[PDB]
Design an enzyme around this catalytic site. Sequence first.
Site, PDB file in Angstrom:
ATOM      1  CG  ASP A   1      -1.738  -1.309   1.286  1.00  0.00           C
ATOM      2  OD1 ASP A   1      -1.094  -2.369   1.398  1.00  0.00           O
ATOM      3  OD2 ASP A   1      -2.982  -1.274   1.239  1.00  0.00           O
TER       4      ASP A   1
ATOM      5  CG  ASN B   1      -8.511  -3.041  -2.126  1.00  0.00           C
ATOM      6  OD1 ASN B   1      -7.437  -3.273  -1.585  1.00  0.00           O
ATOM      7  ND2 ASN B   1      -9.288  -2.030  -1.756  1.00  0.00           N
TER       8      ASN B   1
ATOM      9  CG  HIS C   1      -4.058  -6.385  -0.938  1.00  0.00           C
ATOM     10  ND1 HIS C   1      -3.011  -5.499  -0.806  1.00  0.00           N
ATOM     11  CD2 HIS C   1      -5.185  -5.677  -0.697  1.00  0.00           C
ATOM     12  CE1 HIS C   1      -3.488  -4.299  -0.519  1.00  0.00           C
ATOM     13  NE2 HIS C   1      -4.806  -4.382  -0.451  1.00  0.00           N
TER      14      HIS C   1
ATOM     15  CG  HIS D   1      -9.820  -3.439   4.924  1.00  0.00           C
ATOM     16  ND1 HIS D   1     -10.806  -3.068   4.034  1.00  0.00           N
ATOM     17  CD2 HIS D   1      -8.819  -2.533   4.778  1.00  0.00           C
ATOM     18  CE1 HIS D   1     -10.415  -1.994   3.368  1.00  0.00           C
ATOM     19  NE2 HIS D   1      -9.219  -1.642   3.811  1.00  0.00           N
TER      20      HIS D   1
ATOM     21  CG  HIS E   1      -6.637  -4.818   2.431  1.00  0.00           C
ATOM     22  ND1 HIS E   1      -7.026  -3.937   1.444  1.00  0.00           N
ATOM     23  CD2 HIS E   1      -7.778  -5.369   2.912  1.00  0.00           C
ATOM     24  CE1 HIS E   1      -8.344  -3.949   1.335  1.00  0.00           C
ATOM     25  NE2 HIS E   1      -8.824  -4.802   2.225  1.00  0.00           N
TER      26      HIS E   1
END
Length: 504
Positions: A170, A254, A336, A346, A373
Amino acid sequence: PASTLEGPSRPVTVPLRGHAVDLPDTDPRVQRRVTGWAPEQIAVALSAAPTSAWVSWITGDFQMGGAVKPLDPGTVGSVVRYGLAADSLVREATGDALVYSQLYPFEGLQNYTSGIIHHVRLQGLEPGTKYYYQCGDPSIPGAMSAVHAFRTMPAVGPRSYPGRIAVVGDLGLTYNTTSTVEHMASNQPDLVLLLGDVSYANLYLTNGTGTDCYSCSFAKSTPIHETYQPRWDYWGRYMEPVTSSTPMMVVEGNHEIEQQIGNKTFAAYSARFAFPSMESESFSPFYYSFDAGGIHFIMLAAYADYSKSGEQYRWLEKDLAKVDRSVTPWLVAGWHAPWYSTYKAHYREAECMRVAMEELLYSYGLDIVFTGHVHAYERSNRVFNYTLDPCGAVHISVGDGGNREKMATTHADDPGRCPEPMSTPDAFMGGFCAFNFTSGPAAGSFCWDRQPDYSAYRESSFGHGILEVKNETHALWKWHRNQDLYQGAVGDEIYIVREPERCL
Ligand SMILES: *[C@@H]1O[C@H](CO)[C@@H](O[C@@H]2O[C@H](CO)[C@@H](O)[C@H](O)[C@H]2NC(C)=O)[C@H](O)[C@H]1NC(C)=O
Ligand SMILES: *[C@@H]1O[C@H](CO)[C@@H](O)[C@H](O)[C@H]1NC(C)=O
Ligand SMILES: *[C@@H]1O[C@H](CO)[C@@H](O)[C@H](O)[C@H]1NC(C)=O
Ligand SMILES: *[C@@H]1O[C@H](CO)[C@@H](O)[C@H](O)[C@H]1NC(C)=O
Ligand SMILES: *[C@@H]1O[C@H](CO)[C@@H](O)[C@H](O)[C@H]1NC(C)=O
Ligand SMILES: *[C@@H]1O[C@H](CO)[C@@H](O)[C@H](O)[C@H]1NC(C)=O
Ligand SMILES: [Fe+3]
Ligand SMILES: [Fe+3]
């Protein structure tokens, strides 16, 4: 430092402590510094075996807005000249060229098409050895890169390991990203793993306006989740000092979905990076495997069908069956979305992937999992199926690479922060697998009311990790926080000790 041999440690939460700003397109590190068809965004990736590697690059500026005309990739060749010394590039390899586009059929949205992307695989390389190379097209004046160099992974063997393996996720492309990358590069890793969510181009409208939160800002006012693809090019240009000299393995997150015309997804991710898809027989950019010394790495897809009936799962079964622990004592996976993060963000989002794949991986003695993530750092105790287990993998999540989205700070176990179960599953992959616990301290609930005992360490800071595998049984993990710049600073450190006679 502590050691997993001691059993689980009592959970630690670092108390919470600015703003994260994207690099502007005026930053000299993101501007086009070459002309004509000269290579830019040069990057090295591993093949499945240390005896081969990928060199990739782009030639030609992208096109943003107006009537974009995709380039004919056949107009610029794909050549790498390489050798054991900078003045003796006597070997040659040729490869493939392609382009991709980002097209939106809605009034007022702007289209994009890339420069020509090249991927060349070098074969017959010595392991553990420095190779100099130039890439480009020798038939076009001025279209060859400067000489660069990288070092192949050490040979596959139980006492042969790359010295330092950097782990990040990320990243995005903020000033905080540059701090992450500067910290990482100063630790001189031999290999970089990037666990998804690369450029965050999908935080921008096609007209170049960005936000810290797409849903918050643009969801109700745009016909699709837009992207500004030049952020990918800025990212590749900024990262070239790292990628042209250090192999980097990427797996999708994502933010790489980037849906466009005709339901097409992952165009930029699938085109821009080299993956050992053919060599590891995954035949997919979304998951694959490779050896680096005595470590077998598996990169899995949280955003491709992971069900037990699917193609990825069948491939994974076959890949694991081929692992010989006397040759590669270490088995390490990256994907991820974390399975054991305790942040609210999440929380349990990838539960269906855990239910699909965790038992298979446990039966094969998976040692360590790395994920991104979640925009924070967390390390679990050894855990299997929500139970502390001396043969369970260590799950480490380093999705704290510095992108402009909010840091994860709230924990699911914080008073009043346990989310409604139906809100947690990843909507892209669908399904719901996150039922209330049936045993342990949180039996009957969806969340704990304190830091779960399988969480060893969690801290809401940006940073990167370095893994130093020492021999068949011991590896040193260190995570470094960006706000510490003094020499030797370490935020979290542990010896991961495997016990194959106990667990396999
Ligand atoms: C594998 O590597 C580990 C870590 O380097 C070795 O354990 C260390 O051994 C030295 C010398 O005996 C000790 O001073 C250290 O305190 C040990 N550290 C830990 C965490 O145990 C281990 O000996 C190595 N094993 C083999 C077979 O080479
Ligand atoms: C962008 O590409 C789409 C699909 O080809 C097309 O429908 C649209 O007209 C293009 N937009 C512009 C401004 O050209
Ligand atoms: C991100 O970088 C800015 C500017 O250097 C800094 O002030 C801020 O504290 C950083 N954010 C975090 C979470 O470290
Ligand atoms: C881009 O489009 C959005 C929505 O139409 C608008 O609010 C924004 O101001 C535009 N940005 C630029 C640079 O035009
Ligand atoms: C995980 O835990 C649940 C509840 O105890 C159990 O039903 C399930 O079978 C377990 N999955 C395994 C061991 O793979
Ligand atoms: C699951 O746990 C939550 C609290 O965490 C509770 O509100 C909910 O009713 C429980 N659902 C079931 C089926 O037990
Ligand atoms: Fe992210
Ligand atoms: Fe993500």
